[PDB]
Amino acid sequence: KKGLGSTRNGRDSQAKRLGVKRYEGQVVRAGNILVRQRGTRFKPGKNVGMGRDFTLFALVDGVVEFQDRGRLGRYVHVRPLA
């Protein structure tokens, strides 16, 4: 019954929690993060912004919204105000 041993295909990597964090119409505070992502899939809009890892974080307190610039991408903004 004694057979062979082994291949090469069991390696994997561990999870990165890739997602939109806060969603549209969610109250967010200051500094919060909104989009953890790979690249510029959703782009930083009004009162948003990103460093290094494409991380959309609110510059200022407000409400989060989505608008679709079809061509120009997808944009997450911040409605400060109230």
- Interacting residue ranges for another protein, rule: CB under 8 A: 1, 3-7
Nearer to another protein, 14 or 81 (CB): 81
Place of tokens 């944009």: 75
Around Cβ 37, how many Cβ atoms within 10 Å? Answer: 18
Alpha carbon distance 43, 39 (integer Å): 9
Nearer to RNA, 26 or 31 (CB): 26
Alpha carbon distance 35, 7 (integer Å): 38
Residues 51-80, mask of contacts with Mg ion (x by CB under 5 A): --xxx-------------------------
Nearer to another protein, 7 or 14 (CB): 7
